[PDB]
Amino acid sequence: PEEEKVAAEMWQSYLILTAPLSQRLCEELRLILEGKRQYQICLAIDDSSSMVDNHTKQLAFESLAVIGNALTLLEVGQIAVCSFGESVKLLHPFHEQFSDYSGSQILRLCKFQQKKTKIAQFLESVANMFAAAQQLSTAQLLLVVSDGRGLFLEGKERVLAAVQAARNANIFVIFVVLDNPSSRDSILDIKVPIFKGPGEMPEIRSYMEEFPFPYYIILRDVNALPETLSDALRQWFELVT
Template sequence: MKGDYKTGKRININKLIPYIASSYRKDKIWLRRTKASKRNYQILLCIDDSFSMGINKANILALESLALLVKSLTSLEIGEISVMKFGEKIELLHDFNNNFNDFNGSYIIEKFNFKQKQTNWKLLLENTMNYLNQAKLSNNNNRNNSNGIENVQLCFIISDARIQQDRENLRNNIMDCINRNQ
């Protein structure tokens, strides 16, 4: 715990008396945790680009959710963010290696048209597992993982959840992801 902040977790007792003596104006009396996290997050956001999303007007909610998640995660500086759209075809719109900014965000939103005829869930899960495995391997090679930082991968799937394929195979694919700590 370090620092002189206006908000925080604990009060710095040494700053308390000057705070009261200044008629409560010198209010930087709080301490915060400043140690870096022992985890590096790789977060993949998958958005359904199928026609059914447009029928229910879930497309607007999906894009708002995408913007909210990206803004929140970048402000927390939690790690790397990647965005993928899926339907009949899968397309990676933003990969982990690029920093996220407003220009990238507008480019990503323009790529969604919500006109794909169906959602291929099996293809999505297979591509997601392969992409996350490749990202983990390249991340381990780049950082050599000698500093003890754990790589954690998360995948958020934003969809209307209309699953036409075999649900049992999808369940098995999801269990494979869980077993790989993805």
């Protein structure tokens, strides 16, 4: 319990690597943002065990350090952090300020040992959390940090409806697909068969052709996160105006 020292030391080592990246992201976002309203941003971390199988654990923590601190440097607004997998956990509320101690707490509580990746359950729950905070005060943004694999165990129709429900609630969603280059297969190489007719050859399409999120970026290297994510946020800012 007092071994929060281990988590704090680990977060500090992440800040050493990601400090220049977080400043480049802050600056690039500032340039885009000038081109009275308040912003509410939620960072969602995939806590499922496939993150260990796909070696996206480091990318997940590096991305949280880069993004969470850049938004704090930019003074955009309130940041919430959630974890999902077998259940939804609110690790950092909107009204509390996001600090280094907040990052250490998320590091200690995310062990990537959950046995499910219930993304539909997550999306359905965050709408209530966003809607309660819209009325407390605004532009709302959800960033999903996940390997983006094994997302259809709840059913494709349910997952697609959950993404559609977030949009209907005026929540802008960007999926940050973590794709480790060291891994045997890239998410771009996963395929999906389409059948039609008895005994006829199936059509082999790419798995990403049925990705349930229309707005996404692919992140192989955290060094590319400032340039890629700030470009992606152009669409959110333009829609808000």
